[PDB]
Scaffold this active site. Structure first.
Site, mmCIF file in Angstrom:
data_model
loop_
_atom_site.group_PDB
_atom_site.id
_atom_site.type_symbol
_atom_site.label_atom_id
_atom_site.label_comp_id
_atom_site.label_asym_id
_atom_site.label_seq_id
_atom_site.Cartn_x
_atom_site.Cartn_y
_atom_site.Cartn_z
ATOM 1 N N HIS A 281 -49.545 136.925 153.787
ATOM 2 C CA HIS A 281 -50.626 136.003 154.150
ATOM 3 C C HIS A 281 -50.307 135.183 155.403
ATOM 4 C CE1 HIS A 281 -48.583 132.409 152.597
ATOM 5 N NE2 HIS A 281 -48.458 132.958 151.402
ATOM 6 N N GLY B 36 -45.242 124.706 153.223
ATOM 7 C CA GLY B 36 -44.400 125.537 154.059
ATOM 8 C C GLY B 36 -43.214 126.151 153.353
ATOM 9 N N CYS C 99 -43.489 128.801 151.353
ATOM 10 C CA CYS C 99 -43.747 130.231 151.218
ATOM 11 C C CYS C 99 -42.663 131.047 151.909
ATOM 12 C CB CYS C 99 -45.116 130.585 151.814
ATOM 13 S SG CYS C 99 -46.463 129.538 151.191
#
Ligand code: CL
Ligand code: NA
Ligand code: NA
EC number: 3.4.19.12
Lengths: 301, 301
Positions: free
Chosen positions: B41, B143, B145
């Site tokens: 993503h 942040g 991820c």
């Protein structure tokens, strides 16, 4: 966004762990620049353990009596000295993985990470607090003497603790990296146990502020207490007294939540006098006291 | 002897963490050999949130659209592909800090360590478990991820999780390192929520066995149960059913302590109806379920 007891990344310390053997005793040492730091009781035999004269034990030792192993590599010991309860072994090679570091001494209630090692090899990492009774409620097994506790600030590793012994209850006791014990302990096989522990009140408040930032807020009330009145209650529940310095430390969480500290103390006073009424806070049946205010600051912004 | 929740030493993973930027989005990537793995993503824009067509979006991307930074070094992307929900960026430099590693997909109830990272920088490490509802109870701020979960039982880093997203309740969902989500989740901003979570019964029982090994006795009783009667009680408290595989796995602990598995199951039945009554098991007034039979056997021996 979630909350957990977090340790610092241990990589910078893993590159410093070595194995130290004297006689049949093997434990962990910390290799920084060209010195290996480890507990001085590595030089004790079975007979000395009761009351060892460390002065005469180390005079009798020679450099070749210490085997220091960094993986397959044997480091040659070219000197040895003692700083309080910590042994310093000068080796002929500076550690190329030496991080930016300093030695610091912490206060009870402050937190740090421990890299638990066995026979020189890092096994695990956990976050803990220096208890008010100067013990650590971590558990690494027998061979973990010489494992170290540390904080990381910017890119600097601050070493604050070295494990020396396990106490009868299974909590551990140790020194700073200059060899001064935390707590009224001695590195001899004699009669030693941990004093009565208390709850680190400033960290419970910090964690209550964390629950409020997590939206867990059933415990907030309209009331405000006085510091004197709160300490009388807390001291009767074996809670550490709360100082004006503790109050100022919590200031940031105060202004961020709209909960004044003595307003939050009114919440904690009722949790003490009433219990949590079959509820949990942040999914705990008990009050967590190993999150400092700074730990709560970092782990939310 | 208080079994604490230990993470694995994180240094081998720290040396693999990089920063990956596409457009205005920055998250973490995992740099192993000449490939950086990250959540796909990262290629989405704010229009692409609900129903991104990842194969359409990736086709339109050039190697030059990806900014990969390892410290103060930029790594040039020379190819890109997608495997399920994981983006793989081929780079022109193999990571010299690549450890021995493997990719594994784990089952619910399994534990692992997470190296929580921000903008490619390791921030903390914690220990957790794959919940029966296929989510993680972690701490992932904005942040986070691309942070990864791992075990290091021997010499090899087994990567088992990559963080993709936080769900409405604050728990976390992600994939294995081959890009397959754990649970029914998808990397879209369409409405999703975690199912009701349950307690990992086999892990609770392992933890009671560890308490006994540690010397706790207070919760033991003289009863046994049948596996079927225990499962009727367990499910009434939203505990996972115990399978015969679970009974087999607890066999080692059953024999170290001399307490039959179904004998210990009778203790758990009693703890569910009575609570702790002030007491603590291994320094905890909650029943711990994120410590596996394997974890117990390890941190013993
Ligand atoms: Cl598994
Ligand atoms: Na109040
Ligand atoms: Na029983």
């Amino acid at each position: 966004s979630g909350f957990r007891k977090m340790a610092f990344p241990s990589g910078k310390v893993e590159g410093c762990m070595v194995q130290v053997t004297c006689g049949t005793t093997t434990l962990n040492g910390l290799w920084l620049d060209d010195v290996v730091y480890c507990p001085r009781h590595v030089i004790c035999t079975s007979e000395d353990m009761l009351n060892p004269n460390y002065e005469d034990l180390l005079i009798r030792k020679s450099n070749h009596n210490f085997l220091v192993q960094a993986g397959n590599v044997q480091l040659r010991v070219i000197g040895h000295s003692m700083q309080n309860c910590v042994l310093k072994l000068k080796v002929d090679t500076a550690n190329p993985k030496t991080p930016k570091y300093k030695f610091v001494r912490i206060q009870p209630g402050q937190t740090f990470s421990v890299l638990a090692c066995y026979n020189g090899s890092p096994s695990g990492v956990y976050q803990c607090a220096m208890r008010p009774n100067f013990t650590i409620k971590g558990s690494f097994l027998n061979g973990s003497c010489g494992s170290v506790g540390f904080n990381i600030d910017y890119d600097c590793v601050s070493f604050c603790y070295m494990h020396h012994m396990e106490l009868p209850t299974g909590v551990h006791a140790g020194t700073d990296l200059e060899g001064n014990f935390y707590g009224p302990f001695v590195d001899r096989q004699t009669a030693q146990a941990a004093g009565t522990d208390t709850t680190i009140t400033v960290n419970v408040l910090a964690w209550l502020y964390a629950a409020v930032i997590a939206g867990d807020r059933w415990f907030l009330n309209r009331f405000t207490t006085t510091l004197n009145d709160f300490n009388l209650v807390a001291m009767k529940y074996n809670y550490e007294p709360l100082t004006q310095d503790h109050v100022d430390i919590l200031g940031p969480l105060s202004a961020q939540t709209g909960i004044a500290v003595l307003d939050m103390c009114a919440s904690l006073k009722e949790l003490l006098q009433n219990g949590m009424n079959g509820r949990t806070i942040l999914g705990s049946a008990l009050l967590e006291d190993e999150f400092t205010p700074f730990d709560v600051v970092r782990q939310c912004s």
